[PDB]
Symmetry: C4
Subunit: 385 residues, 4 copies
Amino acid sequence: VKLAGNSSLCPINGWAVYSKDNSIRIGSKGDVFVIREPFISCSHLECRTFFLTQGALLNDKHSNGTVKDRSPHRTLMSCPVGEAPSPYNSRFESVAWSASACHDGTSWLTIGISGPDNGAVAVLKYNGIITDTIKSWRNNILRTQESECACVNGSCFTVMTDGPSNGQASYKIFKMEKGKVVKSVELDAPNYHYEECSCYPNAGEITCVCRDNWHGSNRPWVSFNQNLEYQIGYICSGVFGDNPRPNDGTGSCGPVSSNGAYGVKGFSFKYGNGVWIGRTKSTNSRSGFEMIWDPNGWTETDSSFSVKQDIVAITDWSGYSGSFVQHPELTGLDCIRPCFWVELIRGRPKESTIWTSGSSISFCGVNSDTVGWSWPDGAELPFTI
Amino acid sequence: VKLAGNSSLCPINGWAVYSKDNSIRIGSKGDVFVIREPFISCSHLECRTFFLTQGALLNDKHSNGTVKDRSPHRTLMSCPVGEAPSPYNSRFESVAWSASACHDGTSWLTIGISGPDNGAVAVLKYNGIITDTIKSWRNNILRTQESECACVNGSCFTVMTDGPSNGQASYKIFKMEKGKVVKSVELDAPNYHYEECSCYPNAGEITCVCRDNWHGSNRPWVSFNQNLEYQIGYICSGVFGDNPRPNDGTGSCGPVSSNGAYGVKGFSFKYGNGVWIGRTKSTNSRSGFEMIWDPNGWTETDSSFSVKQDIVAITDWSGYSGSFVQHPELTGLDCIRPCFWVELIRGRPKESTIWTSGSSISFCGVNSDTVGWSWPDGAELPFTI
Amino acid sequence: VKLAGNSSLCPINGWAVYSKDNSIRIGSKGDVFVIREPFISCSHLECRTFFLTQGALLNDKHSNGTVKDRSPHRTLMSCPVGEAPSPYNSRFESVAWSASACHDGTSWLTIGISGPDNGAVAVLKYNGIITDTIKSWRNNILRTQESECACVNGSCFTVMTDGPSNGQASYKIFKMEKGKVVKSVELDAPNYHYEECSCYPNAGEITCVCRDNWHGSNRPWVSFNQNLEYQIGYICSGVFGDNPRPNDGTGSCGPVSSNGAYGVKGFSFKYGNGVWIGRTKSTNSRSGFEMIWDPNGWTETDSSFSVKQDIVAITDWSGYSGSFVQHPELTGLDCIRPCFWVELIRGRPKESTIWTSGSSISFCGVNSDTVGWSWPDGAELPFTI
Amino acid sequence: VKLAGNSSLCPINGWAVYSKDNSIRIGSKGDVFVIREPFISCSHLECRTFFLTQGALLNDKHSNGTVKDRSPHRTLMSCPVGEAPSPYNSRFESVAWSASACHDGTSWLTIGISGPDNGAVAVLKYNGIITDTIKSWRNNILRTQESECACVNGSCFTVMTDGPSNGQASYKIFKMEKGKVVKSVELDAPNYHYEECSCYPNAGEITCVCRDNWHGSNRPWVSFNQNLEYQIGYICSGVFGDNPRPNDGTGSCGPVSSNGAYGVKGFSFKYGNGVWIGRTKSTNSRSGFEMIWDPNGWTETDSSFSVKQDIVAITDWSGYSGSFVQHPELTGLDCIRPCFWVELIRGRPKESTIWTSGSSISFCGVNSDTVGWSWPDGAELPFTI
Ligand SMILES: CC(=O)N[C@@H]1[C@@H](O)[C@H](O)[C@@H](CO)O[C@@H]1O
Ligand SMILES: CC(=O)N[C@@H]1[C@@H](O)[C@H](O)[C@@H](CO)O[C@@H]1O
Ligand SMILES: CC(=O)N[C@@H]1[C@@H](O)[C@H](O)[C@@H](CO)O[C@@H]1O
Ligand SMILES: CC(=O)N[C@@H]1[C@@H](O)[C@H](O)[C@@H](CO)O[C@@H]1O
Ligand SMILES: [Ca+2]
Ligand SMILES: [Ca+2]
Ligand SMILES: [Ca+2]
Ligand SMILES: [Ca+2]
């Protein structure tokens, strides 16, 4: 029975820890995959962790990592939430150096992109069998979310980008049914830059908060209905959500240029004019993480917000983060449960090792209260190398 | 279908070996988690061993163990009984440094407590999805059972402690349905001290024999009805159950102070006025283990009992032990099966190693006869380190 | 639906290979249990390999093997047929240094013996839960089949021995239903010696070919109805089946004392007056294996037989062997499939290693034809040690 | 419900990546089987990777490989597609040094050949239980496909060969149901040579594109109906598909002798008079791979074709490749999905190592457009040895 996306986000006060895989600590001896972007996505029965791997295990020579980010060995795989990804427990999803995934209430939809930079192809799979294809339309590194896609009333949506990771690029939203694209639309976003979008359904519509790797310190967003009729803009809060970024000053609803000329995948949940912002604690490195609730901060510009909940000390490494959802058909709740995951990146380029891999941690909405704390990776580098 | 807890503990005469994981022996080479408090809990279909892990494998540097007991890397996980807990056969349960779990006949309820000592929070998960949250009400290490919680007529119950592990602390019994706290009561237990309670259902009510880490060599207990109406006391048997403890002399129904100023998690099963006491054979170390049947020693003070069933020789290490239940809905029986598990702790602080982990063995009630013997851990220390 | 054992053994011409786990070759690097007696047993849906482990992995110091055969670390476990027994793939079954197991059509019945030699206790489990217990009645190493038990019309049977492995011992046949002994009978077998019995159903009755470790080179047997009414004797074929044994001269239906005062677990399939004798190729060592069809040789004394099919070359090591069956309820056949497994023992006492473990291979009945050959263990010794 | 193979091959324009196991790369540290011929086969619910192993793991001395190709340790096993084959995730299928498998909609049929060269026997298993047997009829290495068999209307078909690998051999087509050979036919193919066939169903009939190891650079084919009434020939295209082979010159519908005196397992898909030829890129080595679409080329002789899609660069090792099928019962399509898998061989005889093993990559039909690229094995040799 297809997943209805007609309810709204559950109201929340804080975030309770949901999972921690300690994959890097475990990989020190155990056969664990060296991964990146471990995004979580759920069905009507379970939540799994998808990730991308170079096809190498920690503490092995094949984790050398000097390899191009987009190699032909990069594959999309998944394993149950909270477990360390290893060949002994991970399911194979797709060959990909960029992907996204989601369940529509019936079967899983996975999107893996592979191929050369000048003509990559997104392979759509529905319940493990290829159902469609999408070719780069700008021949300049087709890429997608690196996090969960959003499904509503039996249709799922994703956002792909094609073009330079600097200046203007091309951006399209896709709507698929049973893994088949039934409609796509190019965004008319001059001066915007979308990458690695974290999307989620809310009252039958989708909202995506993404990464402006071109010239913005704030995060850009797109929200659209089931017919790809959309709207775009930026989070106006002076509580800049990208990394790097400048100290929290006055923002704008259009790309803040001051230091936002690069970035990190991230997310944000919208509630009225308010926004739950997930971000690193450092303005220069992917270190630490914290959840900030800036009411009237999605449409306004301030430096003021009401709540700050710590997740990773500034003293420890963090990395990509993304939103994932829990539907009422899984929860029994009468609303959509917002949750998020954080990638704790270890190794290069910040540490003196020959590899790069990340652990994951995740938290969910919740009405009751929580506590801020630090749940870092905890691995002692360097490894036996 | 919900687990009815209306029947009574089956009448027994001894304890038969149920399981032995040989985790440490296996971990010398295998990818086994370094664990603590491996408690067992069953559903209406299977039994699992839950445990807490620092997220490190045996024989790996990350097992350094100098780390604080309550680290953000501690996670609650579970695997099938008798199996060595590895990242390849364990399911992720919750992030926690203290926890409990039980099945109501429908889904698993897990309780993982994590966060800072002055504001730790217990996350409750029904079927893997956060269903409620509990905050430290004393801001001094909210902690729980470290063993199975007890369910009855669709409601599960647990005991939590907050406050000093020395003098008076606070104790609350919680009643939850579908992982949600519907009622809670704070025990008016002046001069009592409760920790790591081992609870079990019996004729529609719950009984917990716990650990008095403040000032008792004997074990305190609490039994309550489904409405949290309770009674409290101490096992009065001169066969003292805690460790450390004095030589078996004359007991009492209120904290025996001679030597009882510390402790170890344990259990005891009440039968009329008698008691089946599980305990270490040594009075100073967590070494050895034996079952003692003191008929009518739950209310009377003696040193005499009638049956002693050896489990682990004084020459071998033991540790935490807890009780776990088999419901008629799993057994087909017309009574509830009292069973117990013993943690065989190896390493620090008693052994010259850099780590500390434990193996498990479990036994079950039974009418037919048994035999005493010694089922120690069996690992040759130290390891490759 | 209970397994009906009313059909007879399927007629056969030879034996086709069914499986080979290569556990020892794989154990060189993999995490394989060091094991003994990997007997096979099937349900109405699958076949599993059961085995006993000291709880150590190959190539690990804990596989030291100088330990007493019956240690408190020996555990009964199973994994799918053909797979290497590892803690990552094996299911825990019971704590035991001696055991048997069989499925009745509904659930598995496992029997594990543990405890001291002067009072070992067999714990019977049905679907993982203890359903009965049997104590030693001679207080001298209670032991059982070390292979599959036989179930018929919803009742399972097994044979246990208690007493010396030299002279006269005591033997009993047990009948259980849902893991509970409903009837037992002590065999009045003066001058007989039964050990490690290989039993199987045939037309509603059980026939067991065992090991006479006291004073017989030929194998003794017992057959009984569902009410434990029995018959006993020895295979009279001059083609002696035990090991050690003398060269095939003239047998008798009463213990051949020439060279058979020790032994090895083996099996045999009776067809009318004929016999399919499985046995080692050497008369002094557990080396090589072969299947021999001596028609009119279960009741007669000769040296002549009509067929010899090679399984393991005299040049390679063999060991325990046992029968297992495949019921029509699993097969679709209108008869019971006779099959057998062979333990390929490597290490001590015949090799200069510090351990002892075995691989397994199995074969099944079959109308079509087969071929003789050699399916040896294949591991290179010694190991890294 | 039995797989109906009455529909035809789906029309296609290119091939989309389906999987990549990275087994060898992962095998540097992880416990991965050293394998060969990892052919893929699907049921009505999942797709699996079958493969032959010497019962050894990468980077372990037992991978020494100087062992005969046909050893008694070789076993046919299978794990899920895209997963590295390890003893922790692979299912045992059969003892075999030559094999094939396919699902008929109800259960899996596996065929594993074992035994000596002068009398090998093929064991057929339907749902894991032996259902038939086939003896060598020429006593000269009875061998089979090493890829998926084809099922249609409840009957599966395979092609086996017995006799020399040089001159004339004997070729037989077997029709089996529920794993029992209901009919067979020896091909009357003078001057033909069939080995390692890649068969597939289409409109109720089977077509196989095999390997001529005797005297052909082009591939021989056989197509038959469900009554084993067949036709034979060679692909006439001057785009020679075998390896070794000559530069694409002029083909013939009869063995192209020149340079065609050896070979490699391969496949091809026929569409009218056209062919989708998969082949290595090199003409002397098993390196590189590409898919070529030569319309009107199955019946014609040319050097011209319209499409070439790279899969593996000439600078990277390839190996065996074969075809596997999707059926409309697993896909929901109204046609049969043609797919293929390529074996990436690393080690001997081309590389300075002691072992030989292969990784796998797979692609499927697809109407949408794809991209040619290079998805090589990616391991860094030599290994720790
Ligand atoms: C520890 C290790 O293997 N590091 C090597 C490094 O020495 C070498 O310079 C580099 C270039 O290929 O590859 C890896 O980084
Ligand atoms: C063998 C080993 O790795 N032990 C180290 C030890 O040398 C060091 O003093 C301690 C302090 O962090 O950490 C670990 O215990
Ligand atoms: C390689 C190894 O550790 N072998 C030891 C051996 O040296 C020692 O004499 C014996 C005593 O228990 O134990 C093991 O056999
Ligand atoms: C690295 C290694 O151990 N290789 C050995 C090689 O030295 C030996 O000559 C050969 C003969 O069996 O076996 C293995 O290939
Ligand atoms: Ca930016
Ligand atoms: Ca105490
Ligand atoms: Ca004997
Ligand atoms: Ca050729």
